[PDB]
Amino acid sequence: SSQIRQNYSTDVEAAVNSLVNLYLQASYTYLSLGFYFDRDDVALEGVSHFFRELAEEKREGYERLLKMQNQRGGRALFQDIKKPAEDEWGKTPDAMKAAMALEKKLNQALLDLHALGSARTDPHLCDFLETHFLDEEVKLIKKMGDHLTNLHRLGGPEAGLGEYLFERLTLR
Amino acid sequence: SSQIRQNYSTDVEAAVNSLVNLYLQASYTYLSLGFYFDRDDVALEGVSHFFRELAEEKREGYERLLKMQNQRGGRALFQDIKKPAEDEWGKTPDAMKAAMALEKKLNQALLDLHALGSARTDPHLCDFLETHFLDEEVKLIKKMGDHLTNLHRLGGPEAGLGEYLFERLTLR
Amino acid sequence: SSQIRQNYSTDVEAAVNSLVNLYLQASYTYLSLGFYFDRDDVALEGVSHFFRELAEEKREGYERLLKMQNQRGGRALFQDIKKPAEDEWGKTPDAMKAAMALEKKLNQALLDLHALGSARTDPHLCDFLETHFLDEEVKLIKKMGDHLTNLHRLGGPEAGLGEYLFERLTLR
Amino acid sequence: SSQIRQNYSTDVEAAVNSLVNLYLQASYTYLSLGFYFDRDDVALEGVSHFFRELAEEKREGYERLLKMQNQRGGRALFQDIKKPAEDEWGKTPDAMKAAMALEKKLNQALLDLHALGSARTDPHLCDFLETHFLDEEVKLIKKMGDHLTNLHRLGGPEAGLGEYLFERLTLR
Amino acid sequence: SSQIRQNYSTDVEAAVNSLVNLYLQASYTYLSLGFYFDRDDVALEGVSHFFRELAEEKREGYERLLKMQNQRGGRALFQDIKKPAEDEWGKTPDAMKAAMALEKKLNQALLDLHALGSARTDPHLCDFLETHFLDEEVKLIKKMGDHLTNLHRLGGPEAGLGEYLFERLTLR
Amino acid sequence: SSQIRQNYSTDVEAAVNSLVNLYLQASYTYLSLGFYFDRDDVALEGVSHFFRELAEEKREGYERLLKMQNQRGGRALFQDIKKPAEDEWGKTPDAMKAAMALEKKLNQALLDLHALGSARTDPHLCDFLETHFLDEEVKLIKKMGDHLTNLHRLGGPEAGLGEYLFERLTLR
Ligand SMILES: [Ca+2]
Ligand SMILES: [Ca+2]
Ligand SMILES: [Ca+2]
């Protein structure tokens, strides 16, 4: 019986905690991706930095969610964070495709939470996601799509050369 | 027949003017609270300043509402501003609880107006409240709840000592 | 039985609280005037700003009075603030005439309070009004009289043109 | 089959492209208005600058829309841009009235697109319009209404004098 | 019967308005080119920026023409702006070739207008085109020719790699 | 068969990955502690900040470990991160005691890894822990012990008052 709680559905409270878990899992996946591309036998510095920056973005994500949960009088419930689906992430096109699929999964969870908040008439939640999450995901999915198009353009039997040039001239 | 008016419901226009009155009443209540704690026999400077700052925040509230009313071609209708419910506000926990109840009443009016604007399909109104009012109230209600928890922690037979320390070390 | 109270008449204490109400009502009237001239079908920006600045001056008025009331060991008693006498204020000459009448009413209340303080031998009150209120009202009534003379000079069948030029070149 | 497209209705995609056309047409109309008032036999510099600035605002409008269309995986489809409805725009009140009607038409298209996005459950679109378009149009329609009120105030047999003074003292 | 008009042929006046239309159409074509290369499945940022900058150059073109038309006492007559000939512009060599053909068409119209002005003995027009248009087109056509030569040099079965390197190292 | 690997035991490689998991779990526990003390019904800002800073310190811990793992030609193997042992952490003495026990567990794992590296004759590992981890833990355990002593000193029936003063004057 939180003293500050006002028109904050338990369904929304639970869905927020599930989204916190998904973002924790996403940060952990990008941690693994970043350190895989820091391996001596992969050695793509710009790719590692790209995924390491995303792990921090996902970290700021669930931290913002947890701040909002407390602002609204909800209660954070933390669950186990599943390990990444892969230990080895292959080459840069395979890794970017996995990151693309992850961000789309996060985007679908955000849109479902917005739809839940609308059904429960929670405008603070809906505007909170609109302000901090929805456009961020749209922009990131666009950038990953641009990267995948250029990587496909740089494909073929010169794929290794293309991988090097992409890291050097697009990702630094 | 305002020349600029476009998809601005009379129900919304009236509800905005009622919310202007509620904010005028809220500012007036915080005026009384601020000067009560400036009394020589109460003498809690940080508490007076806390409530005096809120009276200004409520003032910027109804001024923003009145600006929006004119932007949308609505017409401000001013009614009498009721006096505060109390002349003497007791001790700091009692005053903070009254301020908490006031902000929750304002928040409920904001959420009802948002629900009205959604039913009437008024997205400018809905985004206007989301941008300027809804998060402000959530943040303020959270801060008041934090204050009440610390005041309860500082309660007991040392309540006067606790009241002094709260004003000195949390509210300045 | 305020510990600090020294030669502060209850008649003066009551008259101060009545003057606080009159100043609250005056600020509220100038709020309505300012937003009336911000309407799209009135659209006189300098006139709105002129009255909006006066609402703040009246606000600093009753705040100074309430500070003095506490300094002298008196107790603020807040009453309902009556709405403005008009919802629509006509043209700039009609509005300035109403503001003139309001300031004269405030001035007469100030002079009556000074006369009461003199009869009750309250020199702090009398000097307080002399220092902060009496000259302010004399100056403001003079400026409004100057505005009304120029508005009458700019009257006639070119009144709309005169109203525009007054707002542009005198009031900004 | 855009790789990035996620919950972006084809109805919304088409409506965005239609709104891009309406904004292209609006910019073109304000181009004509600006250069009409730069004619030697009209010669109202502030009026020309007012409409020339609006043509740029409409340009930033459809550019923002086209950026969003690509961000969401939609595809821009450009159609012919219709010429302005008039070659000669009369006097400043007639021109401002036409600009008013144009902005109201744009506002109605924006509100219809928002209603479509809500029906299709597209919160990124709805917040995109709320953030960048809806308040901009409300503010602009208010300013045009203010201009029309002052122009009507400056009307009568001194209309030419009023037109000159409006351009000199309001529009520069 | 413009009061300022002096030795300004109606044939020249009409030809200027036709050139204004051609420049409006050219800007619109470069708008489409710029946003096509901003698509996620094309994703060539330097190419999009190259064509977006040209749309602004064509915009400054017809604005200069319209300013001159008013300076000489001519009257702007705006017609419908035809949509671009293509919705999809293929790869960078195909797009640059289309932009090349467009600039050559604009250059031929400029040279024809200069020839008309010479036949009509209009030295202000002829020098106006010489100062602001003719060298600009010669320089731009040269740069596009340089780009096409390098793109052809970077062709072959490594065309995708060549396209990426051209955008990265020549166009940014 | 990493090309760079030189005298890096598989036992050490595995123990490093286990320590990475323990540090990930430690950061997650301090995340929960920080947001628990940000709850409206706990409301101890300095305590939340204290634990939030520690979550970042543990984050820099496993990041340093993962960097070292790649430097030595080892391979990171990520496992599931267990949730914190508690959802609610009680009062500040109970939370500090849990953080104390956690840091001692981390310290014991560090000392065991150092002992393993010494047995396997891995001086880079041993100096790496000495330089970056061992003194950090000794300092932190000392500070927590100091906090617990002061919290016990501030205990008794004035425990709530003591909790407030500790947060205000030691932890900010
Ligand atoms: Ca919104
Ligand atoms: Ca005196
Ligand atoms: Ca020449």
What are the structure tokens assigned to F146, written together?
């100091």
- Name, in order, each residue with C-beta under 8 angstroms of E37's C-beta and a sequence gap of 6 or more: E43, E44, E45, E47, E48, E51, E89, E92, E95
Of A28, A31, A40, nearest to F73 by CB-CB distance is: A40
Structural contact between residues D93 and D148, judged by C-beta atoms closer than 8 angstroms: yes
Residue D81, SS3 per DSSP: strand
> B66, B14 in Cβ contact below 8 A?
no
Cβ neighbourhood burial of A66 (10 Å; 0-12, 13-18, 19+): buried
In chain A, which residues have their Cβ closer than 8 Å to the Cβ of D124?
130, 134-135, 138
**How far is residue C96's CA from residue C148's CA, in Å, rounded to a whole number?**
7
* One-character DSSP codes across D85-100: S-S---SHHHHHHHHH
B46 touches chain C (CB under 8 A): no
**Annotated domain spans of chain E:** 1-172
Instruction: Report the C-alpha gap between B37 and B149 in whole angstroms.
Output: 20
Rounded Cα gap, residues C60 and D28, in angstroms: 51
Three-class secondary structure assignment of B68-122: HHHHCCCCCCCCCECCCCCCCCCCHHHHHHHHHHHHHHHHHHHHHHHHHHHHCCC
Q: Which of D9, D128, D111, D122 is nearest to D66 (CA)?
A: D128
Per-position DSSP letters for C101-149, written without gaps between them: HHHHHHHHHHHHHHHHHHHTT-HHHHHHHIIIIIHHHHHHHHHHHHHHH
Whether residue D134 contacts residue D118, with contact meaning beta carbons closer than 8 Å, is answered with no
Which method was it determined by? Answer: cryo-EM
B3, two tokens: 């020349």
Name every residue whose Cβ is closer than 8 Å to that of residue B143 and which is 6 or more positions away in sequence: none
| Cβ separation A130–D123 shorter than 8 A | yes
CB nearest B123 (choices: D100, D114, D148):
D114
CB-based burial label for A83 (10 Å; 0-12, 13-18, 19+): middle
Distance of alpha carbon B159 from alpha carbon C45, whole angstroms:
53
**Ion ligand 1 nearby residues (CB, 5 A):** A 127, 130; B 127, 130; D 127, 130
Contact F167, F47 (CB under 8 A): yes
Angle (CA) A37-A38-A41 rounded to 5° is 75
Kindly determine whether residue B40 and residue C76, on different chains, have CB atoms separated by under 8 Å.
Answer: no
Nearest CA-CA distance, residue F85 and chain B, Å: 25
Around ion ligand 2, which residues have CB less than 5 A away? Answer: C 127, 130
Question: For chain E, how far is it from start to end, CA to CA, in angstroms?
Answer: 51
- Given a contact cutoff of 8 angstroms between Cβ atoms, the answer to whether E153 and E49 are in contact is no
Distance from Cα B99 to the centre of ligand 1, integer Å: 28
With 0-12 / 13-18 / 19 or more C-beta atoms within 10 angstroms meaning exposed / middle / buried, residue A104 is: middle
Instruction: Give CA–CA dist C84/B26, Å, rounded.
Output: 19
Q: Nearest CA to CA, how far is C90 from chain D (Å)?
A: 14
Dihedral pair phi/psi, residue B141, rounded to 5°? -65, -35
Both tokens of residue E68? 């001159």
Task: Tell me the H-state helices in chain D.
Answer: 10-36, 45-71, 92-119, 123-129, 135-153, 159-169
Resolution to 1 decimal, in Å? 2.0
Q: For A1-172, which CATH class?
A: mainly alpha
Strand partners, D81: E81
Phi then psi dihedrals of residue D38, to 5 deg: -90, -5
Does residue B102 sit at the A interface (CB-CB below 8 Å)?
no
Question: How many whole angstroms separate alpha carbon A39 and alpha carbon F68?
Answer: 11
Which chains share 3+ C-beta pairs under 8 angstroms with E?
A, D
Two tokens at F88? Answer: 């609610």
Separation between Cα atoms, residue A131 and residue D130, nearest integer Å: 11
| Distance, CA of A22 to CA of F133 (rounded, Å) | 30
User: What φ, ψ does residue F64 adopt, rounded to 5°?
Assistant: -65, -40
Using CA atoms, how far apart are residues E160 and A154, in angstroms rounded to an integer? 6
Across the interface, of C40, C42, C160, the residue whose CB is closest to D154 is C160
Q: Which two tokens stand for residue C5?
A: 């109270």
Length of chain F measured in residues: 172
Answer yes or no: are the C-beta atoms of E15 and E116 closer than 8 Å: yes
Q: Are D12 and D126 in contact (CB under 8 A)?
A: no
How far are the Cα atoms of B38, B151, B164, D72, F158 from residue B161, in angstroms, in the given order?
A: 18, 11, 5, 59, 11
Judged on CB neighbours under 10 Å (0-12, 13-18, 19+), A172 is exposed
User: In the Cβ-directed half-sphere of C93, how many Cα atoms lie within 13 Å?
Assistant: 13
F64 burial type by CB count under 10 A (0-12 exposed, 13-18 middle, 19+ buried): middle
Chain D interface test: which of B6, B67, B118, B121 (most D C-beta within 10 Å): B6
Q: In this complex, do A41 and F77 lie within 8 Å of one another by their Cβ atoms?
A: no
Q: Which amino acid is at E30?
A: Y
Number of H helices, E strands in chain E: 6, 0
Q: What burial letters (b/e) apply to A19-44, b meaning 16+ CB within 10 Å? A: bbbbbbbbbbbbbbbbbbbbbeebeb
CA distance D129 to D113: 9
The β-bridge partners of E81 are D81
Closest chain B C-alpha to F162 CA, distance in angstroms: 9
Closest CA to E21 of E81, E66, E109: E81
B/e letters for F153-164, b = 16+ CB within 10 Å, e = fewer, are: ebeeebebbbbb
8 A C-beta contact, residue F43 and residue F15: no
| 3-class secondary structure per residue, D15-35 | HHHHHHHHHHHHHHHHHHHHH
Contact between A153 and D145 (Cβ < 8 Å): no
Chain C contact partners (≥3 CB pairs within 8 A) = B, D
Among D162, D108, F149, D104, residue whose Cα is nearest residue D171 = D162
Residues paired with F81 in a beta bridge: A81
Long-range Cβ contact pairs of E107-116 (< 8 A, separation 24 or more): E107/E134, E107/E137, E107/E138, E107/E141, E109/E18, E109/E19, E109/E22, E110/E19, E110/E134, E110/E137, E112/E15, E113/E12, E113/E15, E113/E16, E113/E19, E116/E9, E116/E11, E116/E12, E116/E15
DSSP structural state of residue A81:
B
C104, C141 Cβ separation under 8 angstroms: yes
Ligand 2 centroid – CA C15 distance (Å): 20
With contact defined as 3+ CB pairs under 8 Å, the chains touching F are A, B
Question: How many C-beta atoms lie closer than 10 Å to residue D165's C-beta?
Answer: 17
DSSP 8-state symbol, D47:
H
Which amino acid appears at position B125 of this protein? L
Kindly list the residues from chain E whose CB atom is less than 8 angstroms away from the CB atom of residue A154.
160-161, 164
A121, B115: Cβ pair inside 8 Å? yes
SS3 category, A82: coil
With tokens 């679908």, the residue in question is: A108
Q: Give the Cα separation of B61 and B19 in Å (integer).
A: 10
Chain C interface disruption, residue of B2, B18, B41, most C CBs within 10 A: B41
Cβ E49 vs Cβ E105: under 8 Å: no
Contact in structure between D69 and D75 (CB atoms under 8 Å): yes
A67 at interface of B, judged by CB pairs closer than 8 A: no
F81: phi then psi, degrees, rounded to nearest 5:
-95, 115
Minimal CA separation from C7 to chain D, in Å: 56
- Is E57 flagged in the annotation as binding? yes
